[PDB]
Design an enzyme around this catalytic site. Structure first.
Site, PDB file in Angstrom:
ATOM      1  N   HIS B 325      -4.643  -7.884   7.222  1.00 50.89           N
ATOM      2  CA  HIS B 325      -4.356  -6.508   7.617  1.00 50.89           C
ATOM      3  C   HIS B 325      -5.629  -5.670   7.663  1.00 50.89           C
ATOM      4  O   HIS B 325      -6.618  -5.955   6.982  1.00 50.89           O
ATOM      5  CB  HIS B 325      -3.362  -5.837   6.658  1.00 50.89           C
ATOM      6  CG  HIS B 325      -1.935  -6.236   6.875  1.00 50.89           C
ATOM      7  ND1 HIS B 325      -1.225  -6.985   5.962  1.00 50.89           N
ATOM      8  CD2 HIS B 325      -1.080  -5.974   7.891  1.00 50.89           C
ATOM      9  CE1 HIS B 325       0.004  -7.172   6.408  1.00 50.89           C
ATOM     10  NE2 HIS B 325       0.118  -6.571   7.579  1.00 50.89           N
ATOM     11  N   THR B 352       5.760   2.135   8.966  1.00 53.32           N
ATOM     12  CA  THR B 352       5.881   0.692   9.150  1.00 53.32           C
ATOM     13  C   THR B 352       7.291   0.155   8.898  1.00 53.32           C
ATOM     14  O   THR B 352       7.539  -1.016   9.188  1.00 53.32           O
ATOM     15  CB  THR B 352       4.894  -0.047   8.238  1.00 53.32           C
ATOM     16  OG1 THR B 352       4.997   0.467   6.908  1.00 53.32           O
ATOM     17  CG2 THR B 352       3.482   0.134   8.726  1.00 53.32           C
ATOM     18  N   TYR B 376      16.071  -1.022   0.278  1.00 55.51           N
ATOM     19  CA  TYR B 376      15.120  -1.483   1.280  1.00 55.51           C
ATOM     20  C   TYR B 376      14.592  -0.319   2.110  1.00 55.51           C
ATOM     21  O   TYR B 376      15.365   0.521   2.581  1.00 55.51           O
ATOM     22  CB  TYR B 376      15.773  -2.516   2.204  1.00 55.51           C
ATOM     23  CG  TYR B 376      14.937  -2.792   3.440  1.00 55.51           C
ATOM     24  CD1 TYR B 376      13.799  -3.575   3.360  1.00 55.51           C
ATOM     25  CD2 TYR B 376      15.269  -2.253   4.676  1.00 55.51           C
ATOM     26  CE1 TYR B 376      13.025  -3.833   4.467  1.00 55.51           C
ATOM     27  CE2 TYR B 376      14.489  -2.508   5.799  1.00 55.51           C
ATOM     28  CZ  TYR B 376      13.366  -3.301   5.680  1.00 55.51           C
ATOM     29  OH  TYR B 376      12.562  -3.575   6.765  1.00 55.51           O
ATOM     30  N   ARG B 396       9.535  -6.287   0.523  1.00 54.53           N
ATOM     31  CA  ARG B 396       9.364  -7.454  -0.340  1.00 54.53           C
ATOM     32  C   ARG B 396      10.060  -7.228  -1.680  1.00 54.53           C
ATOM     33  O   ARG B 396       9.529  -7.523  -2.755  1.00 54.53           O
ATOM     34  CB  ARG B 396       7.884  -7.781  -0.526  1.00 54.53           C
ATOM     35  CG  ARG B 396       7.168  -8.144   0.765  1.00 54.53           C
ATOM     36  CD  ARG B 396       6.816  -9.619   0.777  1.00 54.53           C
ATOM     37  NE  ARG B 396       6.058  -9.964  -0.419  1.00 54.53           N
ATOM     38  CZ  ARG B 396       4.745  -9.805  -0.537  1.00 54.53           C
ATOM     39  NH1 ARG B 396       4.039  -9.320   0.479  1.00 54.53           N
ATOM     40  NH2 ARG B 396       4.134 -10.130  -1.668  1.00 54.53           N
ATOM     41  N   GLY B 412       8.614  -4.657  13.753  1.00 57.48           N
ATOM     42  CA  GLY B 412       8.321  -3.581  14.672  1.00 57.48           C
ATOM     43  C   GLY B 412       8.561  -3.998  16.107  1.00 57.48           C
ATOM     44  O   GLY B 412       7.816  -4.815  16.660  1.00 57.48           O
TER      45      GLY B 412
END
Lengths: 435, 435
Positions: B325, B352, B376, B396, B412
């Site tokens: 990243h 994101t 989540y 996660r 995405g």
């Protein structure tokens, strides 16, 4: 409005705390963006050299001490992927080199450690901190134990590990010691002067003279080790219990290592970057380092294929937490008929604790120093059954014996040394452990 | 010829081993060339928002949930130099943003977590791993307890810590779970297609669509956490026990933090250096990252002195252990009348896990997804009594409830998304925890 207890970090983890706490609605929140620890016990053999005599479990052996040690330790068919994998743990005293060089009459021993002392282990644990895995090992390298005997020994170790020591959460018993010098400050300054004058007269280029200090032991030696490993995280930490004496140290300087036939030495000699570029100047400090690199190139070159010697990392800068140094790595391929013992004999003792030229400097050291060095300025670490080896220079090392605690530190005397500065440098270094 | 037991590294240290082992001639040899862990227990308050109602220890409170939480937690005269220092630990569900934006009708909740759940603590421990010191704290922030009561509570915690849990050395109970999808693979691909077409028609630029998976719980949840913190060392690890459900996660992505009036976001979006310079190309991946940096600049800018917003670390490259990243840091000075709650409302939920433009993307997500997101894609962490705050994005993250284990992961969607690739990306991400 506030109450607090501090627990030392080495007796409790957040997992252990969670499992043991009995409170309601327990939560853990962590932020997690150390290589190996070896613990060894119940040795099969003790190998020791003292008063010119070699002993194995008390029996006299008529052999050279290093050749015998390697022969007993090395197991050709043995392999393992852990750093130690079984073998000898102990030290080689500075004075061992007198067996292979003529350094003159050795002064009186006021401590009385043997010149070499190893324990030989097939029962040990390896903490692989990177993987957070603990390997508890029982092996038959030296005993030919049955598999049944290994399993019984292992079960006993595991049962002991389940049972807490009764003092795990007591505070550290770190009573501070009152260290007394072993020579007068003015006598050390006279020794510095004598060595300085020899250097001016062309006798040699550098001579490391040391002072010893000692105190009546107070407090707990192991708790000193527990505090030491937090305040001095070096590549080498060690607590050796020989029974009637202990060796406790945090040497940051490797003497020599052997790994899969490769011999390695590691010459060590914006406020961050400020004194950094200053250190890369100072033609005296770089010359010092270069001199140590070249000593390593020649030492390795004498025992290796000559065109395999490589300086793989050169005069890069490494910043510790009390002093700053220039660092390098020298490697070579050990010749096929030689072993780690030849690597040890080629490097002991390190240039930074002896001088240049080394043999002349060692003769001069024992014309000036009044006490046998012993453990100080020798080599501490392990010899693996694989024939691999990793040895630290025995500096920043304390000896507990005769109900006293001994520390010692040296200074490199050169042609423009100031005796008072070198007396100070020596007492500060020797006592920086004491904290 | 060899026997070995592996012990997990979180229940034994080399110091503890040395103290407990009973063998002869014990030696330790170590090589030592993680920031904080918070453990909290016996909370004074539970603060929860569910079914549109705010509760404190079961009592209905007629207040906005975030304003009330801050008012109860924040103590003006309280200061401490530990990261947490007392306060609330818990989460804010994705759906909390529906209180402050019109995102449309929220789908059916198949899990049933509250939209917000915090416990409020004045009894906790902080592991300062860098200093290897453990701070066991009993405080009177929320109770006005006497100093006598703090000392009794502290003594009880310490007595519990001395007593080993009976299963400390049992192997990890990591039975693997059989996760089943909550939607058909072809239905998710149809959702991707629908979102893709909207993006082509100008409706929006990006839309994060997610899949949920769940399994009947088998094995031990805490042992899963013990294994998780070794295999996924993130800036955020957490095991929250709410009683009838648990939250276990290893989010690598901060949502927002507030520290001494500074708001910070951390946009995240030779074989080493190879894919590194490749990543600095790819005008699609850099554009992705830049878009997240600019979102952070605007979010912080809305709640700060506008000329205090600084990009202090820009598109530097950070390499994790499953994916790579581009990373940046954005900071600003929070306006004097605002608090960490305004920082939370300005950033929740992260770009994101939502899309661009965020509000339109959130309306589209709930026209396509068939289950309320819940934990989540919300925010997990703490709110300190100092008013400092540190919140992770709830990715996660696993939810244990209703005797099932729920995981979820998004992708995405953009104008050239391939539906099959995004179905795969989603199931791989959601299940990479499961290992």
């Amino acid at each position: 409005s506030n109450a607090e207890r501090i627990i030392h970090g080495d007796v409790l983890s957040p997992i252990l705390a969670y499992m043991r706490l009995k409170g309601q609605h327990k939560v853990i929140l962590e932020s997690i963006p150390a290589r190996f620890s070896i613990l060894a016990y119940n040795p099969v053999f003790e190998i020791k050299f003292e008063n010119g005599v070699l002993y194995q479990n008390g029996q006299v052996i008529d052999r050279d001490p290093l050749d015998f040690l390697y022969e007993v330790i090395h197991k050709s068919q043995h392999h393992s992927e852990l750093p130690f994998g079984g073998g000898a743990i102990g030290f080689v005293g500075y004075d061992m080199i007198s067996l292979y060089e003529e350094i003159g009459q050795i002064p009186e021993d006021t401590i009385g450690t043997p010149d070499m002392h190893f324990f030989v282990y097939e029962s040990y644990m390896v903490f692989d901190h990177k993987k957070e895995k603990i390997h508890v090992i029982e092996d038959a390298l030296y005993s030919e134990r049955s598999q049944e005997a290994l399993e019984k020994s292992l079960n006993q170790v595991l049962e002991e590990l389940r049972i807490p020591a009764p003092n795990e959460f007591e505070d550290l018993d770190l009573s501070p010691l009152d260290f007394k010098p072993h020579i007068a400050p003015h006598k050390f300054e006279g020794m510095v002067e004598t060595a300085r004058d020899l250097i001016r007269n062309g006798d040699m280029f550098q001579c490391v003279l040391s002072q010893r200090f000692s105190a009546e032991v107070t407090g707990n030696p192991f708790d000193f080790y527990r505090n030491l490993r937090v305040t001095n995280p070096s590549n080498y930490l060690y607590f050796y219990d020989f029974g009637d004496y202990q060796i406790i140290g945090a040497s940051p300087e490797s003497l020599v290592s052997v790994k899969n036939g490769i011999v390695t030495t590691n010459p060590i000699a914006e406020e961050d970057k400020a004194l950094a570029t200053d250190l890369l100047s100072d033609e005296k400090e770089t010359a010092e380092h270069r001199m140590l690199v070249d000593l390593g190139r020649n030492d390795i070159g004498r025992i290796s294929e000559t065109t395999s010697v490589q300086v793989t990392k050169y005069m890069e800068v490494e910043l510790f937490r009390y002093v700053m140094h220039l660092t390098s790595v020298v490697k070579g391929r050990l010749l096929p008929e030689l072993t780690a013992m030849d690597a040890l004999k080629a490097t002991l003792p390190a240039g930074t604790v002896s001088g240049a030229p080394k043999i002349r400097a060692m003769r001069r050291i024992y014309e000036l120093e009044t006490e046998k060095r012993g453990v100080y300025a020798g080599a501490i670490g392990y010899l693996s059954a694989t024939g691999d080896m990793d040895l630290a220079i025995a500096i920043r090392t304390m000896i507990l014996k005769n109900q006293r605690a001994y520390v010692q530190a040296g200074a490199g005397i050169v042609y423009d040394s100031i005796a008072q500065n070198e007396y100070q440098e020596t007492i500060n270094k020797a006592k920086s452990m004491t904290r």
